[PDB]
Amino acid sequence: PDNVMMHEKKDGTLMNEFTTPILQEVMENSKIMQLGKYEPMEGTEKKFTFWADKPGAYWVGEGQKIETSKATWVNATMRAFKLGVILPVTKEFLNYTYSQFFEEMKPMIAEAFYKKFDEAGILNQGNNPFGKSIAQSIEKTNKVIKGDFTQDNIIDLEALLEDDELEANAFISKTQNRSLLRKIVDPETKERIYDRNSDSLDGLPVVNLKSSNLKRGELITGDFDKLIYGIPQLIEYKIDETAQLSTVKNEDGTPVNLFEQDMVALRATMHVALHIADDKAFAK
């Protein structure tokens, strides 16, 4: 029913015209997107796995084709706060309409969902886990190299998963753990493993995770599923928050401190093929 005109509608689902640009930026900003593979769904879905072989010939032997069914659950969430307060809802939103509101919002909510997807994706330090993660896969299938930045060890991480399961692909590494990789050198030929211009150790693309958790850490993943539905129902209320923190070390009081807030809710979900490498130091 609604198009542009006005905004006196606190609750309800977004129009899919204004939804789909935000998901674009969620994907662009996220590193897990660049590592994983998307697919369409509605709420909760079952899907199948693995390759298949060609029949039609006279048949002699060949290996059998493995199949397995996977289910997806769990929902994301986001109390926006910062923009709703700055443009005092209703009457200022009347000038901003339904359209120009979400156009201005788009940037930061996409980055916010990105940050949580990666924080509760590669490792358990994120707030909302769903079942399986990369850290948890490492705990089950234990393969660790401890405190090494030589040439050989780089191949071992790939060789571990190029033995049980097939084919290595992309790397991940934070900004602090970057200069050490550039400093490495081959004794035979004058050339660097990690290239400064193009982020690739063994000629496979690497991405930079900004979350301040790791110190010395590298992991490999190829086949991986990232899942979004795309219903971001917005709900606006002005009462005391739990997550939001105001200025110093005080509980955020939207009634007392005359603010206003909006909440958005995505549908984040993963699944893991359980064979991933790991590196971490010990010393003492």
Partner: peptide, 14 residues
């Protein structure tokens, strides 16, 4: 839609 957009702007392959 999402899978096609992902594949269009994915770093792997392409």
């Amino acid at each position: 839609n999402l899978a096609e957009i992902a594949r269009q702007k994915r770093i792997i392959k392409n």
